[PDB]
Design a protein around this ligand. Sequence first.
Ligand SMILES: OC[C@H]1CN(Cc2ccccc2)CCO1
Ligand SMILES: OC[C@H]1CN(Cc2ccccc2)CCO1
Lengths: 304, 304
Amino acid sequence: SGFRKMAFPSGKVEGCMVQVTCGTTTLNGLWLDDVVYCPRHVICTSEDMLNPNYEDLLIRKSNHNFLVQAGNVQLRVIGHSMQNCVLKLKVDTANPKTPKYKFVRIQPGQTFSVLACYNGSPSGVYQCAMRPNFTIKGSFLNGSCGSVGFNIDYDCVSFCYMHHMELPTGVHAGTDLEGNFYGPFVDRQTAQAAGTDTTITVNVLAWLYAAVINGDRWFLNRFTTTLNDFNLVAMKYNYEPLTQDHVDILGPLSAQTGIAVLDMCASLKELLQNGMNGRTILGSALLEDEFTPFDVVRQCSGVT
Amino acid sequence: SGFRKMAFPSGKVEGCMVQVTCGTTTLNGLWLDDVVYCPRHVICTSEDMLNPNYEDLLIRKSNHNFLVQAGNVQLRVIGHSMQNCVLKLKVDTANPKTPKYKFVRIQPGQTFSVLACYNGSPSGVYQCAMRPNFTIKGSFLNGSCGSVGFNIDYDCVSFCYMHHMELPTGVHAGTDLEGNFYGPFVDRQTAQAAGTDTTITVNVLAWLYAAVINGDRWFLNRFTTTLNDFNLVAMKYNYEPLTQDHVDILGPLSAQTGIAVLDMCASLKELLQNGMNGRTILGSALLEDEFTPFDVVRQCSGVT
Ligand SMILES: OC[C@H]1CN(Cc2ccccc2)CCO1
Ligand SMILES: OC[C@H]1CN(Cc2ccccc2)CCO1
């Protein structure tokens, strides 16, 4: 019993982290097979960052300008290319610790673990969600760029995120491993405002199921509702709309607890309208939205 | 910027986890050099667990009764001994992935990462505190016993916890790596009640400092207090007493933010007395006590 915000074991990703230096900028790279992936802004002076022309900046750069260090050994760069907002540095040595991996672009609401790194060295691991506004609420200091987000299915690391940017509001923006930003953000030091940070409704419902499973039941009410009625209340409270897709995904949690999804929706509705009245659920005073239904099933079933 | 509940990178500990089977009981072992450490209750039938005599149960056990598997390879057990509530199984092979390590007994309030394992396989990592009542609020299903708690100082893993028990209240109890329980708990399926789960005051103060550092300042008040006045309020709210030792440990956070410790104490006092009035601090609706001052400095400074 018990329910924790839990990251994937990070060992398989620790084995992939390298330091990338271009001139006076150092940040993190991901070393998979004989390619090192890093944010293209590695080539920028924080002066360049105001209005960078990356193609023009790149002309000035050779393989030998990219310094790649894995532990305290230097990798030989034998090629470099730009793909969207990432550089791929071809190195002469395949990473001997390359795990099975995929690059996936996740959807808003999906959770992943971040291995926070400085100078190619891991400092910590935490669990995130891609916010509905395509930001993440990370913990990232200068030098943390190229830190990656990932899921693990058994022995396969799915890389979903690379850290690029802190917005003036101190929330975070980055790319998939093809170098495409999540949301409308660009790798430029300019005014970039995030949209509404709404709550991931399907994730809240999953975590209410996790609470019931773990004995926290005080909030279960006598009511039910409809998707349309619930969605009216959701919108009023900056909750994302619940679809029949979300209801389907919650099916297994509904099955295990015998609480119909629409009943749990009506319980959520009363919590929104009545508040927590100073009570907690799974040791939280607010409704947690950084567990997916898959996450709740995984942790409640003990998947390795 | 940003502040996350962050575990240590778990790779160094993933490399230490093995499966231990005695008869029909399987749980986790820690393989360091040529010794595998596991909970002694591995030798119990859940029938034995009601009133086990471990010394008498152990007489019935030989080296060959302990089945140790690291990946899908079996280790040869060439010796076994009981030390307090753990078994040490001597194996014929030194773990080639043994990191530099120490066994430390932590104090209540100290934080550590848990690598949750089933069948010797890692499922997740999360950050804990040893509660003032010597319990932890973990996430542990059947098969998770022998999962360990640890801190990392650069390249040295300090093992502080091994999981043994869930109390009837669904909180967790375990040992240091010498097999000595934290708190008054025993490895027996009997009524064992925890004491008061009080808040770790020094940790709350550290996390209020982390909030200020990260731009959350709405709660900073115009007041100060004394250790004695603050402690009167602390006791009333099931907060642990603050000592001059705690004030000293917060010195660096006081220095960086220019907020005297006793001023931050008076801010905490008003939050206890007035509540959060529906506001959040670092995205929490309650006062977080699972970051130490050391943790706040580490994460706010980017230690690897
Ligand atoms: O009123 C309805 C809710 C959901 N929101 C949709 C939304 C979708 C994507 C990203 C941000 C926001 C708007 C604001 O509040
Ligand atoms: O009234 C004072 C506070 C602190 N408590 C001390 C305490 C110390 C250790 C373990 C549990 C509890 C008692 C209860 O509330």
